[PDB]
Structures are given as C-alpha cells and as structure tokens.
Amino acid sequence: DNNTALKKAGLKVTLPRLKILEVLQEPDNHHVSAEDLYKRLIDMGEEIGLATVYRVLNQFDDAGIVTRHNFEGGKSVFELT
C-alpha cells in the first residue's frame, strides 16, 4: 500500500509520488538513476518531467524512503530503504 507508505513518511499522496514508488518497486529498477527512472516513466505512458523526478527522489531521501548512492564518475542511483 503506497498510499499508506507516503502518509507514514509524512508526504501528501500525489500521482508522481505513487508512480515513482511503483518504479522503485520493479525488480529491474531496484537501483535506479533519476534519468533511468524518468525514462521508465516515459515508457509507461506517464507525463512526469525530469525535474519532478529529481524533486520527488530528493524528498524521498529526506523522508527516509530511499537511499542515495554516489559512484565513480558522478553517477548516482536510488533504492528504497
């Protein structure tokens, strides 16, 4: 229940937050960059922009919903905590 997950993390339920959570819950996207998560959203037929993806992920990090990893070469990925 991602509605409950968002409430439990102190965030208003919105479509981008729900759809971003959904992608993070796909096996192939267990770890995902903001750019790849955006591409998956495009593939799904969503119209959620890349800045929104970044904003949501960074809010999720603050809320303790996701973990950020920073790799060599400035490449970054997110996963659910």
Between 9 and 48, CB nearer to Cl ion: 48
| Cβ atoms 41, 27 nearer than 8 A | no
**Strand-pair partners of 81:** none
Cα-flanking dihedrals φ and ψ of residue 23, to 5°? Answer: -65, -45
Helix, strand and coil percent figures for the chain, each rounded to 5: 60, 15, 30
CB of 1 to a second copy, least distance (A): 27
Which listed range, 6-14, 15-23, 37-45, 65-73, lies at the site for Cl ion (CB under 5 A)?
Answer: 65-73
Is the CB of 4 or the CB of 70 nearer to a second copy?
70
Q: Which is nearer to a second copy, 3 or 10 (CB)?
A: 10
Residues in the chain: 81
> Does the annotation list 79 as a binding residue?
yes
Residue type, 76: S
Least separation in angstroms between residue 62's CB and Cl ion is 12
Residues lying near Cl ion in the complex (CB under 5 A) = 27-28, 30, 49-52, 69-70, 72
